[model samples]
Target: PALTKSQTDRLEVLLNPKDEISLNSGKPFRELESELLSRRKKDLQQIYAEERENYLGKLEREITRFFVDRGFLEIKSPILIPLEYIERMGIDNLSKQIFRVDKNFCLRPMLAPNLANYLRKLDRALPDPIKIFEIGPCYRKESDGKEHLEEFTMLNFCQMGSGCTRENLESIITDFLNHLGIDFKIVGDSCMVFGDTLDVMHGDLELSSAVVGPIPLDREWGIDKPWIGAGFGLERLLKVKHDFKNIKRAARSGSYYNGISTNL
Candidate 1:
């Protein structure tokens, strides 16, 4: 039978009840099916990439505006940090996690080292109650876990001096989640990098973590005052909020080019 346009479109539809597949006339359905699926995958990849970037851009702008409006000054710190700075924090196993840039330099596994280093020096001259935040890239020799990425974006901010309090930390966590339209619960967790931290959890993922410090740990960095700070991973944020099945979709990797998977 010579299939009409309508008949051709419905051929693959019969094979698949979802109605997503269609076969053109004058070609073996099997021969053309693979090509159609490939085309669909590419189209999906483009949309996936766009969706991820769009969400990231909006979230970044909204959060930046939120902090700036609250009188927080955003700062940039170097990705390459001094070895002594890492050791000072008492991370326990800094050598294994850090990627050495050279003898004296290494990729920063966390933002605290550089921020704390500057804050320590600024404490003497800068005004009290310094509120500064940084959003940047950090690196580590992470494991093969889906939650771990060797290179990832980090957002860390601190309020130094008297105004930095446990109450402020709690408020910061509440307001930030409300702003993002995310529902989360707070939990007590100890980060290997920072002791006794507040973790914001969405299901199994830790969306954000806050550390309030007045302890002996501060002495290592030459920081003398009590400060409240929090750190969040950008990729994990996307994964939890958007309900992505895999963390790879949120990153610039995977079988897909943008955000879509090439293989089904």
Candidate 2:
């Protein structure tokens, strides 16, 4: 007979081994199970020892420092935003993925709306080339997949005023990724909100979505100046850096700590 359901569930929590255990062997089932459990326990202990720091937190700090050194002012915006902001981004059709707090307000699915409003205000007082960024948790009803997170941290950075052309935007993105020691490729892509974008990809995974604007959407926000913006998933970056099997392992979770399971 094969391993019981309960035994399989226990093994699932442990690191996945390369070789498959044979159930057709003459050996007793308990003996084979014990051996597999033993191997898993040793592997788990090794992972716990090696992964000591909170990788997500460390990545956030590193990114914050990088932008600050480059003269970008960090902004803390509200998590609860008006529903009109979603509409303004031309993503009202994605309302199914939005978490509404009430009729007029919903949790922010992206940082662009707040950033746009801030840019308009900051542009008036600040000198040319307003550089600002925000790092915070964003809510979305995403699929339960290895690459998707219902609530994830986002790092959105924007540069407004002169020198916000497509070439400059790509250059800044290249420098930003290089600072993190990540190897990536920029490709032209389209999204629901941003029509044509430059996506930063590591292998097949998209790490950041970028856009250069004075586009039609800007008119809604009353933004006429040239601008560049990009939004990145912090967990996705950590996942790539650490080679995590599941993205959740790199996110804020009670089930796992520093990519190690807390079940034990």
Candidate 3:
């Protein structure tokens, strides 16, 4: 995008104007814009790196510790899974959203199926009311949009087995919202994929979608115990908190860094 003379004059005032080119030594708008953008990008990169640390640090120190203090074991699961495994999870529009890697393997769309597999295997071995969590990226074949992404970080946790109940789950949601200073409310909206989910809302955007079970959906993954699970988009949380107009800036996934204007 080449800037016209008038645009360049405006930008010259905004950025450092070089006075070594013509008689006035003023550089052209295109050159000035480039130089300004380059310097801004470098500074913004450093600033955002620190911001990212602080934001995620709060989540770890406050939110994660909240769950950890309650004795939840954090775990990591594979991103790539067999088609059969996802099929068993019964996710709606699974075929449409998943990025198929080959004939039977694809990147995971959510953390639930993998977490559920672990819960099923660790059921008898771990104590009743088993608590576990996972935080990682999930992939989807999404179109370009402010609210959607092709790959995004997800945080999922659940308490299963004996003591799990809908009420307990809602309480956890309340505690989490309070801790994050998010004024949210539960709505009757249903998630076709999650099945009987409690949609967590801030205005119109959904920060998280949670579900309670001992229900039939649990049978798909061999989970028979009553439980509550919630999945949150880490990026969505930051976007909402910062009031960022675009997820790319807050999430650090797009070209702009540190909320600085890359076009500058």
Candidate 4:
């Protein structure tokens, strides 16, 4: 399903700089810290904080193990990408991306864009339907939200050289999410199938803002020529652990640590 009434309400607050800023830091920085700290002390959202850390660890292992067991070699792409890399393809133009460093270097918004480098590095080592998962910190021009922030954990994986289709890809992705204990309803309408992205509102502004799919890439990413893409917000999956609380808790992994760790 889409964002609930409560989520929508919170989203409203999040969009408003005044309210969210206050909620984020209160009138004073220390007061906001105290409030979130008090919540932590009560263990209201604490369990899930641990849940985020624990599950993040477990999920990466399982994903990697699943790939290795299937005979696919894992390739780690560079997270610190060049500015021109994103700018060259008009990804920078599309997302209204600005240069972080003039000479080169910017955060990678997604993994598929870097497949050329990955494939080159892999050379002939690229197994049939090359399968890989990346658990890396993707950077971006920052935005504000309950679960949105400057740096958060990201999980992106793909099956390449497999002649994969979106149908098969989405089915398996949905299944994996199910295994991870998240219940989700795909958003968007027929328009989305045609590359109309704004039709889908994840209540995740960062994600909604970053998607370049459902629309023809101004140029070929090449990854999609032989691969299928799938990824998700780690906190969103962990939020399914409870019916209460807001996405902020999930983003912060507030349920896990003393104000810091998570549960296994």
Best by TM-score: 2
Q: Residue by residue across 177-214, what tens digits does model 1's lDDT show?
A: 78778888889998776778899898888888899887
Top model number, lDDT: 2
- Please report how far candidate 4 places residue 54 from its true position, in Å: 5.0
The lDDT, on a scale of 0 to 1, for candidate 2 is 0.84
lDDT of 2 at 119: 96
lDDT (10s digit) by residue, model 3, range 97-198: 888888989898899888888899888798787999888778888878878778777889898876678788888889888888998989866766666788
The superposed Cα distance between candidate 1 and the true structure at residue 2, in angstroms, equals 32
- Candidate 2 worst ten-residue window by lDDT: 10-19
Off by over 4 Å in 3: 1-62, 252-254, 261-264
What's the TM for model 2? 0.86
Which 10-residue window in model 3 sums to the lowest lDDT?
Answer: 16-25
lDDT of 4 at 207: 27
**Which of the predicted structures, 1 or 3, would earn the higher lDDT when compared with the native?**
3
Question: If both were scored by TM-score, which would come out higher, candidate 1 or candidate 2?
Answer: 2
**Deviating ranges (above 4 Å) for candidate 2:** 1-9, 16-53
Show the colliding residue pairs in model 1.
none
- List TM-score per model, in order: 0.77, 0.86, 0.78, 0.60
